[PDB]
C-alpha cells in the first residue's frame, strides 16, 4: 500500500467543551514496521503521542500522532504542518492544516409540528433548523427544559452544502419525537446548537404552545 499522510480537525466537543484540544496527524498505508517519525512544525508545548500500528485496508499498518492541548495554539492562530519519515522511502510526506477563514454565524429556527401531525395527537414531530454556517462541524442536540435529552432520543442529519449564491454556508435539521400531551401540558422543548464560529459558540431556540 502506497502511504499517504492526512490531518483531521479536532472534534467540536473537544474544541468547545474540551479544555485541551487534541489534533491528529495520522499516517496510513505503512507497509512496514513502526520505524517512522512524526514531526510537528509548531512546537507549542505539546508532544507527539505515537500509538501501535493499526491494520488499514488489506491489512496495511497505520501509525498516528496526536498533538494534545492544541486549543491554545489554535487560539494563537498558528497553522500546523506535519512531516513524517518512513523506512519504505526516503522522501518525507507532508501535510498542512490551516484555519478555515470566512466563517458564518448559524441561525436556529425551531419548527413546530404541522397541524395535520398535531391533529392526530399520537405524536408530535418536533423539528429544528440550523442554517447559515460555513464550517461543516456543528454540534446539534435537543434540550428538554433544563435536562439534555440523550442522543438516542432524537434524530439529526449530517451537514451538507446548501443551494446559495456566493456564500458557501451549510444547513442542518434535527427531528425529535415525543408525546403530544407534553407539548400541550406546558413543558417547552429546546433546540440547543453549538458551532465554533459564534464567539459564544452556542445558540438556543425554544417555543411552546
Amino acid at each position: 500500500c502506497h502511504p499517504r499522510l492526512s490531518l483531521h480537525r479536532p472534534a467540536l466537543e473537544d474544541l468547545l467543551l474540551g479544555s485541551e484540544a487534541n489534533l491528529t496527524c495520522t499516517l496510513t498505508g505503512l507497509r512496514d514496521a513502526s520505524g517512522v517519525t512524526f514531526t510537528w512544525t509548531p512546537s507549542s508545548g505539546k508532544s507527539a503521542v505515537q500509538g501501535p500500528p493499526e491494520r488499514d485496508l488489506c491489512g496495511c499498518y497505520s501509525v498516528s500522532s496526536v498533538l494534545p492541548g492544541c486549543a491554545e495554539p489554535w487560539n494563537h492562530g498558528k497553522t500546523f504542518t506535519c512531516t513524517a519519515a518512513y523506512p519504505e522511502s526516503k522522501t518525507p510526506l507532508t501535510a498542512t492544516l490551516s484555519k478555515s477563514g470566512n466563517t458564518f454565524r448559524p441561525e436556529v429556527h425551531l419548527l413546530p409540528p404541522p397541524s395535520e401531525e398535531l391533529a392526530l395527537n399520537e405524536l408530535v414531530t418536533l423539528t429544528c433548523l440550523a442554517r447559515g454556517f460555513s464550517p461543516k462541524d456543528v454540534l446539534v442536540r435537543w434540550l428538554q427544559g433544563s435536562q439534555e435529552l440523550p442522543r438516542e432520543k432524537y434524530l439529526t442529519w449530517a451537514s451538507r452544502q446548501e443551494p446559495s449564491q456566493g456564500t458557501t454556508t451549510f444547513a442542518v435539521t434535527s427531528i425529535l419525537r415525543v408525546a403530544a400531551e407534553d407539548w400541550k401540558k406546558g413543558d417547552t422543548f429546546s433546540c440547543m446548537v453549538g458551532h465554533e464560529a459564534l464567539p459564544l459558540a452556542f445558540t438556543q431556540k425554544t417555543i411552546d404552545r
Binding site: 500500500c1 502506497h2 499517504r4 492526512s6 490531518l7 496510513t28 498505508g29 488489506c58 504542518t81 522522501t91 507532508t94 501535510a95 498542512t96 490551516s98
Partner: protein, 539 residues
C-alpha cells in the same frame, strides 16, 4: 509509391531512381553486393522473401514465421505471401508520407538503399521455439543465402537495433504491425541527420533516442494517448472507437502545410483542455494542490565530456513557497508546474530514454535551459508546441537540428567536446531565431499561445457533442454548446479527483478527469472528418 511522379521515376531502369532489386544490388553504395549470386542460385524451394521499398530492401526467411500449430506447407506460403504484400504496402505508405512531408529538395535523398533483416530465429514444426542461427546451423536458408551473404549480427537479447547504415529485427517480426512500428522507429534512427532534418545533424546534447520514441514514430497502438503522428499503418477494423489517432495516413497528409495545420488544430484543442484544467486546479486547497502537482527542474549532471551543458529533466515535489505563489492559472506557467497524472515520476527523466509525452496530462511549464540543452520531456513538448505554432521547416527542425549551431558559434558560445571545438546553440537563441522578435522569453511565448487560444474559443466553438462519461446510469446527451458547461464539468471532475487519490495500484486510470478529457477528445476528433478545425461555429 502512390504518387504518380515517383512511380514514373521508379518504373524506369534509370539508376538512383529505379525500384528494381537487381539495379540496387548491382550498383555501388550497397554494402554487401555478394547477395546477388546466392540470391540467384537458390534451390528451387521457396525459402526467403524480399520486400523492397523506395528507400529500403527487406530480407527474411520463411522459417522465421513457421510455428508449432503453424507448420510448413501451402498454408505457410499463403500467410507469408499475404503478410509480405501487406507489410510492403505499409512501408510504401510510410515513406510516401515522408516524401510528401519533405519539400526542401531533401526528398531526392530518399532514394537510398538500406537493408533490413529478420531475427535469424527460425521456428520448428513441433514447438514454438525460434532457435537462433550462428552461420553454422543446418537450416538450408543459412546454408544457401544468409551464410554466403557475409555479415554477422550481434544477436542482442531483445529489441530491434539499428546500426547507422543498415538494420536487423531482433525481437519483433517484420510481417506484423509491431514490425511496421519498429520499422518506423528504426528508419528514424537510421535517417536522422541527413533525411528527416535538412542536412543538419542532431542537436549537440540530445542522443539518438530523443528523436526515436517520443516523436517521429507511429504510436505503438491506437489506444496510445500520446502526441504523435500515425504515419505507417491504417486500420478501420472495429478500431474506430477509441481511435485517438489518424485512421488513414496515406490520405490525411498531402504536403507540409497539411501537417502543420493538423498539429496546430490538435494543439488548439489540447490548449483549451489544459486551460480548463488549470483554471480548475487554481481554486484548490493546499493539500490537494500539493498532491496533484509537481515541479520540473533542469539538472546539469557531469557530462561524458569536459562540459556540463547537457541538461537532464528531473521532477521534484514542489515546496510551500511555490504552492503559495500558485494563486491563479497564469502563475502556473511562471512557476514551471507539471501535473502528476501521467508523469508520476519523482526522480529524473534520464537523457537518451524512451520517454513519451502524455496527451491529456497538462504541462504548464514553459521551462527552457539558459544553457544549450533542453532535456527530454521539455524538449519533446516544446518541439511539438513549436510545430503547432510554426511549420515543420521553420520550427521543430530549428528547435532540434543544430541548424543555428553555425550562427550560435559565430555569435560565440564556443565549446570543446570529444577533443574538438564545436558551437553550442541555446534555447534563448533558437527562441530569438524562429521568432525574430515576437517573444522575449519562452514564458511570454507560452502565455501568448494560451491567450490567443483563449480568445479563439471565446469567439468560436462547435455546437453538438455526445461525450457523457457519467455513472453506470444511462447518460448519453450532453450537447455542449458553450464552453461554460465544459469548464463547469472539468472543474467538478477535478474537485471529485481531489479524493480517491490514495490508491496503492490504480490511482490514474480511475481518475475522472482523464476519462472526461478522453471523451471530449474522441468526440471532437470524430465530429471533424479530418482534424480540420476544432473550434468552429461561434461562442
Amino acid at each position: 509509391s502512390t504518387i504518380p511522379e515517383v512511380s514514373s521515376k521508379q518504373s524506369k531502369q534509370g539508376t538512383e531512381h529505379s525500384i528494381g532489386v537487381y539495379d540496387r544490388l548491382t550498383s555501388p553504395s550497397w554494402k554487401y553486393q555478394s547477395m546477388v549470386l546466392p540470391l540467384l542460385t537458390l534451390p528451387e524451394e521457396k525459402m526467403i522473401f524480399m520486400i523492397a521499398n523506395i528507400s529500403t530492401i527487406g530480407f527474411g526467411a520463411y522459417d522465421r514465421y513457421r510455428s508449432s500449430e503453424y507448420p510448413k506447407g501451402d498454408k505457410l506460403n499463403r500467410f507469408v505471401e499475404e503478410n509480405a504484400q501487406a507489410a510492403a504496402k505499409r512501408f510504401r505508405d510510410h515513406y510516401d508520407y515522408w516524401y510528401k512531408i519533405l519539400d526542401k529538395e531533401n526528398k531526392e535523398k530518399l532514394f537510398r538503399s538500406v537493408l533490413v533483416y529478420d531475427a535469424f530465429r527460425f521456428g520448428n514444426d513441433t514447438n514454438k521455439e525460434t532457435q537462433e542461427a550462428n552461420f553454422e546451423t543446418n537450416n538450408p536458408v543459412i546454408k544457401n543465402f544468409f551464410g554466403p551473404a557475409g555479415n554477422n549480427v550481434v544477436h542482442n537479447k531483445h529489441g530491434a537495433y539499428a546500426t547507422g547504415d543498415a538494420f536487423y529485427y531482433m525481437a519483433y517480426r517484420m510481417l506484423d504491425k509491431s514490425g511496421a512500428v519498429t520499422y518506423t522507429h528504426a528508419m528514424t534512427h537510421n535517417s536522422d541527420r541527413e533525411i528527416y532534418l535538412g542536412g543538419y545533424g542532431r542537436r549537440s546534447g540530445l542522443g539518438p533516442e530523443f528523436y526515436a520514441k517520443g516523436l517521429l514514430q507511429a504510436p505503438d497502438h491506437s489506444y496510445d494517448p500520446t502526441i504523435t503522428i500515425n504515419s505507417v499503418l491504417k486500420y478501420d477494423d472495429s478500431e474506430n472507437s477509441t481511435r485517438l489517432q489518424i485512421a488513414d495516413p496515406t490520405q490525411r497528409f498531402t504536403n507540409v502545410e497539411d501537417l502543420h495545420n493538423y498539429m496546430h488544430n490538435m494543439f488548439d484543442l489540447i490548449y483549451t483542455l489544459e486551460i480548463l484544467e488549470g483554471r480548475a486546479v487554481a481554486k484548490l486547497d493546499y493539500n490537494e494542490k500539493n498532491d496533484l502537482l509537481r515541479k520540473i527542474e533542469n539538472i546539469y549532471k557531469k557530462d561524458p565530456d569536459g562540459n556540463s551543458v547537457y541538461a537532464t529533466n528531473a521532477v521534484r515535489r514542489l515546496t510551500s513557497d511555490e504552492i503559495k505563489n500558485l494563486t491563479s492559472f497564469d502563475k502556473l506557467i511562471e512557476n514551471d508546474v507539471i501535473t502528476r497524472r501521467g508523469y508520476i515520476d519523482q526522480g529524473e527523466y534520464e537523457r537518451n530514454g524512451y520517454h513519451t509525452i502524455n496527451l491529456f496530462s497538462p504541462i504548464y511549464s514553459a521551462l527552457s535551459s539558459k544553457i544549450g540543452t533542453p532535456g527530454d520531456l521539455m524538449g519533446r513538448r516544446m518541439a511539438f508546441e513549436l510545430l503547432a505554432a510554426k511549420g515543420y521547416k521553420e520550427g521543430m527542425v530549428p528547435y532540434i537540428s543544430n541548424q543555428y549551431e553555425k550562427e550560435a558559434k559565430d555569435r560565440g558560445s564556443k565549446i570543446r567536446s570529444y577533443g574538438k571545438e564545436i558551437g553550442l546553440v541555446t534555447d534563448d537563441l533558437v527562441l530569438e531565431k524562429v521568432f525574430n522578435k515576437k517573444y522575449g522569453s519562452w514564458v511570454e511565448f507560452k502565455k501568448d499561445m494560451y491567450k490567443e487560444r483563449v480568445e479563439q474559443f471565446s469567439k468560436l466553438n462547435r455546437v453538438s457533442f455526445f461525450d457523457p462519461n457519467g455513472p453506470w446510469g444511462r447518460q448519453k446527451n450532453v450537447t455542449v454548446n458553450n464552453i461554460s458547461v465544459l469548464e463547469k464539468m472539468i472543474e467538478t471532475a477535478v474537485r471529485e479527483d481531489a479524493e480517491d487519490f490514495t490508491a496503492q495500484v490504480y490511482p490514474d486510470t480511475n481518475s475522472r478527469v482523464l476519462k472526461l478529457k478522453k471523451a471530449i477528445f474522441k468526440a471532437y476528433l470524430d465530429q471533424t472528418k479530418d482534424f480540420r478545425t476544432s473550434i468552429f461555429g461561434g461562442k
